[PDB]
A paper describes a structure:
IMP-13, a member of subgroup 2, sharing 92.3% amino acid sequence similarity with IMP-2 and 82.5% with IMP-1, was first identified in the Gram-negative pathogen Pseudomonas aeruginosa from clinical samples in Italy and is a common cause of carbapenem resistance, often involved in large outbreaks. Imipenemases represent one of the major groups of class B1 metallo-β-lactamases found in Gram-negative pathogens, and these enzymes can hydrolyze all bicyclic β-lactam antibiotics. The overall protein architecture of the IMP-13 apo structure is consistent with that of the previously published metallo-β-lactamase fold, consisting of a global αβ/βα topology with a shallow active-site cleft at the border of the two β-sheets. The structural information and dynamics presented here reveal important information about the mechanism of antibiotic binding, as well as a significant role for the active-site-covering loop (L1), indicating that the plasticity of the active-site region is important for the broad substrate recognition spectrum of these enzymes.
Residue numbers in the entry: 4 to 223
Write the structure that this text describes.
Amino acid sequence: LPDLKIEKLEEGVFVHTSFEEVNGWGVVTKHGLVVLVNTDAYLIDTPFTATDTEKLVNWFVERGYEIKGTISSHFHSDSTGGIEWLNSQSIPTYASELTNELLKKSGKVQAKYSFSEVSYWLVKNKIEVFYPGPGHTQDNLVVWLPESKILFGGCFIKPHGLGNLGDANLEAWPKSAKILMSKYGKAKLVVSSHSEKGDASLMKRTWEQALKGLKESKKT
Ligand code: NA
Ligand SMILES: [Zn+2]
Ligand SMILES: [Zn+2]
């Protein structure tokens, strides 16, 4: 299993990359962020495992940062796998009320703190959590960093194909993708869960893939 990677994007923004075996043939790649406000650190998604969440936290703690909070972009384990471990360390975990309902329904440990607001400022003027509407999942969120114009699109941003449709809302995805394009056109960088980082055009590529997936589902 490849090791957790940490890469600096700019001052105050790091991408964490963790890996999971799909079964014998190679691995899934998952990107999240760590955002620094002075000496406060915020996890944007957890790695898949408690073990990789602890490695990630330990890397920032050793450099004099305090983990002030985590946000999970959706209920799937690639965003939420570390919540139980973070809770055991009394590190504040956040998810939307809908995300916590979906964790509870799937027999998973919930985030300690939840919110209902469509636009939720995890950190005033620094970290915005936004619900564009259903897509990859009913609850999928994005995270916007206004000072860097970095959008973390999580598993919503799907420039090359929508992936697993098990929990997806194909009827809503195109509308949700246009809402995102319309709000975050000033984005300098779009970081997705499962693809290479890109420019604002990844939001339009997602819209196109959403339209195509909906069209194909209506044919059969
Ligand atoms: Na450092
Ligand atoms: Zn997912
Ligand atoms: Zn994912």
